[PDB]
């Protein structure tokens, strides 16, 4: 895979072996970073990234279910009680929870 | 300024006009992606990235449902069918995304 990217780059430029291997390794590192971010996006798409959207009103807290075994229960709502807020509980969406948190964070 | 330096470094590695513009643009896109990744890491470290840790089974369970919010830090949790109360765990301030992903990889 890195060979194709290297060929593409040298073509864009013009459309010893140790440093060529170094370029290939940097290309592989870039591909790994892109793969990691794509994996994060896919996991958020499948909705097992429990980023509760904050930053009003209440919401439902559903039952506790364990994901892929482990005796640990996937959270269903995000609850906060300041000393004078009366406390609010907002459900974590099954849609892009991380993306929605980022959006309704960057809005303000 | 940075994209020209980056492609010049790549050329130096290689050698021991529209194409140049396209190369600079793709370098700009890659560095912007890296910059956003670093921004996410910075936000996670500062603590402004609530990611919910998986609730331990050993949770003692509260004395009432979540809406009562009885024992508060911005925890996240779910209602336990055992006694109608909900078992809540605070969001780790330090590294929430990182800690949650570490727990996910541990299983």
């Amino acid at each position, epitope marked *: 895979i890195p060979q194709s990217l290297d060929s593409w780059w040298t073509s864009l430029n013009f459309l010893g072996y140790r440093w060529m291997a170094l370029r290939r390794f940097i290309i592989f590192l870039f591909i790994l970073l892109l793969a990691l971010i794509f994996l994060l996006v896919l996991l958020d798409y499948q909705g097992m990234l429990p980023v509760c959207p904050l930053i009003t009103s209440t919401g*439902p*807290c*559903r*039952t*506790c*279910m*364990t*994901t892929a*075994q482990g*005796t640990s229960m*996937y959270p*269903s709502c995000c609850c906060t009680k300041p000393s004078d807020g009366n406390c609010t509980c907002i459900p974590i969406p*099954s849609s892009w929870a991380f993306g929605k948190f980022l959006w309704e964070w960057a809005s303000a | 300024t940075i994209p020209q330096s980056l492609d010049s470094w790549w050329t130096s590695l290689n050698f021991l006009y529209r194409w140049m513009a396209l190369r600079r643009f793709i370098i700009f896109l890659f560095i912007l992606l890296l910059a956003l990744i670093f921004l996410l890491v910075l936000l996670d470290y500062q603590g402004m990235l609530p990611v919910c840790p998986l609730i331990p*089974g050993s949770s003692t369970t509260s004395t*009432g*449902p979540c*809406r*009562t919010c009885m024992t508060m830090y911005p925890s996240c949790c*779910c*209602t336990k*069918p*055992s*006694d*109608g*109360n909900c078992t809540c765990i605070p969001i780790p301030s330090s590294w929430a995304f990182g800690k949650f992903l570490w727990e996910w990889a541990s299983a």
Partner: antibody
Amino acid sequence: ELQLVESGGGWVQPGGSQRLSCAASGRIFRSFYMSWVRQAPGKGLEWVATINQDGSEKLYVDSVKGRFTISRDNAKNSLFLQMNNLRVEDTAVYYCAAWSGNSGGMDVWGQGTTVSVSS
Amino acid sequence: YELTQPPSVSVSPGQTVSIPCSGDKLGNKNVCWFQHKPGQSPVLVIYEVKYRPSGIPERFSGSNSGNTATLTISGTQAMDEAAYFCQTWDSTTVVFGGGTRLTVL
């Protein structure tokens, strides 16, 4: 979602034993709590038993504590309630309910197996 | 735990029924409402006092005020006729209500 089918109901003498089986169809059965809820003939719903994901926590109603044993197996995706030494008042229709995480209550229910203890 | 419902409440089609579910300290607890039809498995109508599962018509709604709860059904259709049970937790055992029979006249 989940298809729950109960079985193992029929005529039995008092003091006998029955093994009611809920054969949930789907791997997602493994994640939810399950429960057996009995509707007595001509009476209202009555809770019988509740089981968590692994079986560490088994809860019964005071009427049946020490007589019924709720259990589940995840390899076969089945929930078995073993009732021992039934009394004449245990006649009912037993329902297999699942506490789905997307509902917040006993939303998925089974057909309902008619137990009948009689002379 | 004594949890009480009326034996039955019946209305003509169209009106709105407020099924009561009186139990002590019931405001603190959260209440679920199940719809059982003769010959059919119970259907979860309300959870967490005021919330409906996916697919339940918006007609159903829940309420709680002190030592009592209520299931409000608006625009009662000919299918709604059923039995309705309110369920809560005493401490760790779930207690169901007596169940009210709603009949569509």
